[PDB]
Amino acid sequence: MAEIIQERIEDRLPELEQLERIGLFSHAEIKAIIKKASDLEYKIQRRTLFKEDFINYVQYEINLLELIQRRRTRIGYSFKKDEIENSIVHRVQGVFQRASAKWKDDVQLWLSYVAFCKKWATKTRLSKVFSAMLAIHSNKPALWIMAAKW
Amino acid sequence: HPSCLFFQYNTQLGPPYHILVDTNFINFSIKAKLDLVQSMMDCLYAKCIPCITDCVMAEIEKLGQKYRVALRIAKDPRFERLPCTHKGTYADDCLVQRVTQHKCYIVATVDRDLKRRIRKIPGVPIMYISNHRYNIERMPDDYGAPRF
Amino acid sequence: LGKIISDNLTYCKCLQKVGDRKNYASAKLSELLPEEVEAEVKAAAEISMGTEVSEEDICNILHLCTQVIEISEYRTQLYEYLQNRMMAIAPNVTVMVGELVGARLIAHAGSLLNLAKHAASTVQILGAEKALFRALKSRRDTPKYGLIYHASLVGQTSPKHKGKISRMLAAKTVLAIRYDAFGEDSSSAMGV
Amino acid sequence: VLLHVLFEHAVGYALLALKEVEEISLLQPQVEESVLNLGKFHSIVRLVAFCPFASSQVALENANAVSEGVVHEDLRLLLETHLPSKVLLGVGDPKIGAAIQEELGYNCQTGGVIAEILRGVRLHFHNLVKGLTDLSACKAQLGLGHSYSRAKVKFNVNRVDNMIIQSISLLDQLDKDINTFSMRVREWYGYHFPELVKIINDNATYCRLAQFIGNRRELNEDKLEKLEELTMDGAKAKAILDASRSSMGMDISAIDLINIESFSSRVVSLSEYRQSLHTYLRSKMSQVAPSLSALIGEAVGARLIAHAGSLTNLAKYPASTVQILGAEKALFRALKHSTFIGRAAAKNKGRISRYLANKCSIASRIDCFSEVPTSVFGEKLREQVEERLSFYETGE
Amino acid sequence: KKRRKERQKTAGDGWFGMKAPEMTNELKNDLKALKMRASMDPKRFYKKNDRDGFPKYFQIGTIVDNPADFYHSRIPKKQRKRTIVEELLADSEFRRYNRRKYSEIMAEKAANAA
Amino acid sequence: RGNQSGKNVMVEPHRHEGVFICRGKEDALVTKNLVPGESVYGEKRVSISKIEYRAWNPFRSKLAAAILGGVDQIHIKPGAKVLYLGAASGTTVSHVSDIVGPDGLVYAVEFSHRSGRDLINLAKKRTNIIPVIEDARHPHKYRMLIAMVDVIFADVAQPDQTRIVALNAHTFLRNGGHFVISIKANCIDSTASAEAVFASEVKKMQQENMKPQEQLTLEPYERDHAVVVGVYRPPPK
Amino acid sequence: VNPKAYPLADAHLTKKLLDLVQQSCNYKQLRKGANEATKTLNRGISEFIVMAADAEPLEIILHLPLLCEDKNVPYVFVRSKQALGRACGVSRPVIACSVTIKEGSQLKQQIQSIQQSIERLLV
RNA sequence: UGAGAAAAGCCUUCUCUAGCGAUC
Ligand SMILES: [Mg+2]
Ligand SMILES: [Zn+2]
User: Fold this and answer.
1) Helix (H) or strand (E) holding A136
2) Distance between first and last Cα of chain D
3) In chain D, after which residues does the backbone break, taking C–N over 2.5 angstroms as a break?
4) Interatomic CA distance for residues C37 and C6, integer angstroms
5) Shortest CA–C1' contact from A104: which nucleotide?
């Protein structure tokens, strides 16, 4: 139940406390982020699972990344990218991998995963995504063109 | 009621005999120095297939090193090794259950209480050792049996 | 196709338009069928379990369903014909109970004048003859609906009130029957 | 224990990877849950590749290749693409494993833990490949199961007797419907011109004339001449005009005339479909049972099949029972139905019926199992019937 | 309670939803005759009845005619009846035997009473 | 005499699901017709008031004789998948298709090409029958067409029945499934006695990780015939 | 040969078949003719079916193999209807004959040996 | 048997299966 969610929140804690070190975020903002992260985490660890919960989780993390990106330019602080941004991107990649494993037939989820890998992920991670796509969706010529186009 | 029996007479029991051997029957055969297959053929004048269950084999192994000779005789390529899936090692209930199911075996044993149980089951002969010879109890086609 | 389409006339028109499954994809069924449903009809064409039919087999099927649609066209014309004659002969009865129920009432008695000789209670239980005599011999409760059960007024009412409405309708209906049988002027003033 | 398994299904080929398993205790009560439960099975097994079949003909070709144990081009295409090139491949057939090892360097194993994993894949296959293919797995197996069976036996779709039983039932149904409607047409038109029912003896002919003449008031000159063509003889048409001039009928309203014309038109259109169905039955009988149709006729021959229930059932019956199939309707006793040259006396009527039944039994057997059906045997059997008929009638 | 009541009106899905017919004096008369079939023919012997009561789910029908059994097994339409009890009323063999047995019992009983 | 055409009759359910009893002057064993108005092999059918049942002949079918003989379980119930080995023309297969209903599926295996054509014609009318014209000795040659099944019925009449059934059971039969095997004693071994054959066949089933549970003879209808019902890989209790 | 005449007996087995047919005729244990052979299959009293492959239409006896598959009755073909006629004790050629089940018959050992030989032909 | 026996409406405590969840 809450043991896995607790593990994930304690994993999320260090980048939040580093953000509090930055001065990018205030303590009440950290509390609100923790609360909403726990609320979103509780939905995707249930016995009955829906795709929209995964979509909302991914969208919330993307919005948090965008907010951090906007605030870093105003502050002028460019250090500690790896401590926060890479951790968030790794968590989002794990969420995408679980969602794609659960629902293989949904092409739209695969394309959203490809788009996020293009925007935020290393090129080799995007390379692995196309191989997973073409392995089970080799009967669609358009997907072959998109991989060759990239 | 089984179709094999014409009242108390077992018709499907045929000249190739499949017979269940008890653990004490092996030991007394060695004590009287009676060959197992050879003496049975003398009693019936027919081909006989001794059969050993897993429960009967297990009891011989539990006897120990003192009874090793009987264990080596029991594992004989002419013998018929048939399995049994029973939670335990008690063999009298194992043989009795096989008698009730199939009615094609002849019970070879020397234990008194087991023989009194088999006599209550109709149409199944009983084989035992009398004097220095093998004897059959409830068989019409006994032929070369001890005459008394 | 049989599971997805329940309207028999719509089913036969689709068969008359297109013979084989191969021509489902090219042809258009918008005028007969809604666009959202025809997509399901078109989609099932590729994934089919049926066996391929010969050219003579499909022609015979077309002739059969052609006969099916013509019966409905004539039956509609016959039904419209019945409404016209019911309006002219007994206009007051048709306003009250309806064209179909009034026609069945006349057919049961054999004539309009024979129906006029009947009482109000008999018209209520005219259809239910099997329940009436079974109850009368066994001394049970008598039926209360008859052929009036399919009247428009009786159908709309709640099941608790279907007993009261039946006798009120039947008592008023015979007044229209007498006037239509014996009156020399054809009008719907009283029935309305 | 990391290895790859190749699972062949009616929908397509699937390649799967096994991460870990308790091999030695697999066939034990507690460890067996690893493959039975879907959640535990997903833990140790993944789907790395799936190649569905494009069409039913493609699926049938792969089904034959798998049975023969040869490697199809589609199978090698999947194997070469997604397998790295020291590789363990699991297959269910020893013959296909050797063939793959000859074509490609992969090592193939056919037994052991692999046999247990394949049962887990077979049990949970629909969950792994859900949504990857348009055609469902249950229907694909049903579709492929038939088409595989037809190819082995060389089944011919033309020589299928289903339409004959359906046609016979409908022809009996159509006859009852036409007769009922024709009676009401005559009664309705009897109100206006009752003389027509006496002159015309055919229900179909009566409705055709009822269409031609709406009212007896206008039947004269050129319309009489046109009426003469519809009637078989011109004498009756001239008598019809005198009947129209001097009649006891009552004038009908305009709307009553429109109703009767539309009704009497439908009986004619119903009759022509029945005539077309009879032609359809005659052509169908030629393809299925030409020799039986030649011997006894298409109408009687098709009815014999309907009583038997199938062409195969008719052939399996002995000669004595085939006579009984026609006992109720006197198919063999009533001879003009089947028409033969010459006649049989009442004394020899029973003998001819028995002889005709034996010939029909032989004719049905010829039609049933033939490589190609041909009606020469039917004509020879018919000639033998005529010879026996002439033998009894003249005495030699 | 209401879902229990709906399930007892039918035999279930195991027998494709057979319904329990409404019991009438004509249906009850037929079922009583079927139970007492042992005494109809003195030369025919039957096994014991499966249940002492009447079955809850049952249906009534007739055997379809077959073209092959025109002479071997077919009853003419004049001899057919609408119900089982009327068939017992029609045949002479059952009536002739039953009246002899019934009269014998009463003649025995009249002596018993006296 | 018999059950003549045109006689009133009553139909009541049997102890087994999907099987019915035809109560009258005589009692017959009947199943509900999946295709009304058709007779597979000339059996007598009864019309019920839209609903129609077909009589089951125990002399031409071994499953009917076992049911009439007093067997405990047949394990063939509506909505079940059945693998049938040795379908032949399909007389018994038609009754099996009636029991499983529209939801259940029947897999008919028959090597003979002559009898194979009859199965296809029968499969035309019954959508729940999948004809498989292949040898039953090689289950790997038709593994694409068959999914996991619940009951395996074998009437192949071969000396190697147990080996044929065991190979099919390992490949297609699910855990906890059941098998019904008909044994003709004359076919496996003519020299040995009939009952001694039955004991040997039961033993070979145990050596193939199959647990037989019951057996009975078909004496009134067949001579030296037996039917064995068992379970494959029982779940823990 | 016509491929539909698949179980064709060789020279040695043919002599055994025709000898047994003549012996069965003496014991009143033989049914002669295609129609009579069909009736025994329906009544379940047949040991095996012997048919002649030289019938000018082979099609008139092809219904008998279908009945044999349902009753599990072995069957064979022979090359001559004329040779089959002599063993049946008739003056006309015979295209199909059936050996009848008889209780207590002393031909049981010879019949049982033939049934095993026929089953061997079908591999 | 003997908080007699019988029938209705409310809370309390608990038992079985069956999917579902474990793929990052
Ligand atoms: Mg002891
Ligand atoms: Zn034991």
Assistant:
1) helix A123-136
2) 91
3) 85, 336
4) 12
5) H23
Interface test with F, best of G72, G108, G116, G122 (most F CBs within 10 A): G72
Q: Are E84 and E33 in contact (CB under 8 A)?
A: yes
Contact D321 E68 (CB under 8 A): yes
The answer to whether the CB atoms of D145 and F130 lie below 8 A apart is yes
Token pair of F101, please? 């209903």
Which candidate, G47, G107, F69, places its Cα nearest to that of B3? Answer: F69
Q: What are the tokens at F69?
A: 């003989």
Q: Residues 6 or more apart from D45 whose CB is under 8 A from it?
A: D16, D17, D18, D19, D117, D120, D121
Tell me the CA–centroid distance for residue B90 and ligand 1, in Å: 8
Experimental method: cryo-EM
| Residue tagged 């061997």 (tokens) | G120
What does this entry list as its resolution, in Å? 3.6
Beta carbons within 8 Å of E34's beta carbon, 6+ residues apart? E84, F10, F23, F24
Please give the full DSSP string across C107-169, using - where no structure is assigned: HHHSSHHHHHTS-HHHHHTSS-HHHHHHHHHHT-PPP--GGGGGSHHHHHS-GGGHHHHHHHH
- Three-state SS for F212? strand
Element (DSSP H or E) covering residue F181: strand F173-184
Do F115 and G66 lie within an 8 Å CB cutoff?
yes
Q: Is the Cβ atom of D131 within 7 Å of strand H at any atom?
A: no
What's the rounded Cα separation, in Å, for the pair F148 and F177? 10
In sequence order, the 6+-apart residues with CB closer than 8 A to the CB of G22 are G86, G87, G88, G89
The radius of gyration of chain A from alpha carbons, rounded to an integer in Å, stands at 17
Q: Which residues surround ligand 2, an ion (CB under 5 A)?
A: B 53, 55, 84, 94
Output the six-digit token pair for F141. 């040659």
Distance of CA C90 to the CA centre of its chain: 20
Breaks (C-N over 2.5 A) in chain A follow: none
Distance CA(F119)–CA(A30), nearest Å, equals 72
Question: Which residue from F195, F207, F217 is facing B83, i.e. has the nearest CB?
Answer: F207
Q: Look at chain G and count its residues.
A: 123
D117: closest CA among D190, D22, D191? D22
Selection from D20, D357, A111 nearest residue G35 by Cα: D357
Contact of F23 with F90, CB cutoff 8 Å: no
Distance in angstroms (rounded) separating the CA atoms of residues C160 and A19: 73
Tokens 């195991």 — which residue? E14
CA atoms within 13 A on the CB side of B99: 24
Positive or negative CA dihedral for D371, D373, D374, D377? positive
| Non-local CB neighbours of D22 within 8 Å, separated by 6+ positions | D31, D34
Q: Which of D326, G39, D306 has its CA nearest to residue E70?
A: D326
Does residue B85 sit at the F interface (CB-CB below 8 Å)? yes
B43-46: list long-range contacts, CB under 8 Å, 24+ apart: B43/B127, B43/B133, B43/B134, B43/B135, B43/B136, B43/B142, B43/B144, B43/B145, B44/B17, B44/B136, B44/B141, B44/B142, B44/B143, B44/B144, B45/B143, B45/B144, B46/B15, B46/B16, B46/B17
Q: Within 7 A of a protein CB, which nucleotides of strand H?
A: 19-24
D137 with D129: CB under 8 angstroms? Answer: yes
Domain ranges in chain G are: 1-123
Q: Is G72 on the interface with F (CB under 8 A)?
A: yes
Burial of F204 (0-12, 13-18, 19+ CB in 10 A): middle
What is the CATH topology of the domain spanning G1-123?
60s Ribosomal Protein L30; Chain: A; (3.30.1330)
Q: Which ligand is nearest to the CA of B57?
A: 2
Task: Please name the residues in contact with D267: beta carbons below 8 A apart, sequence gap of 6 or more.
Answer: D178, D181, D182, D185, D203, D204, D207
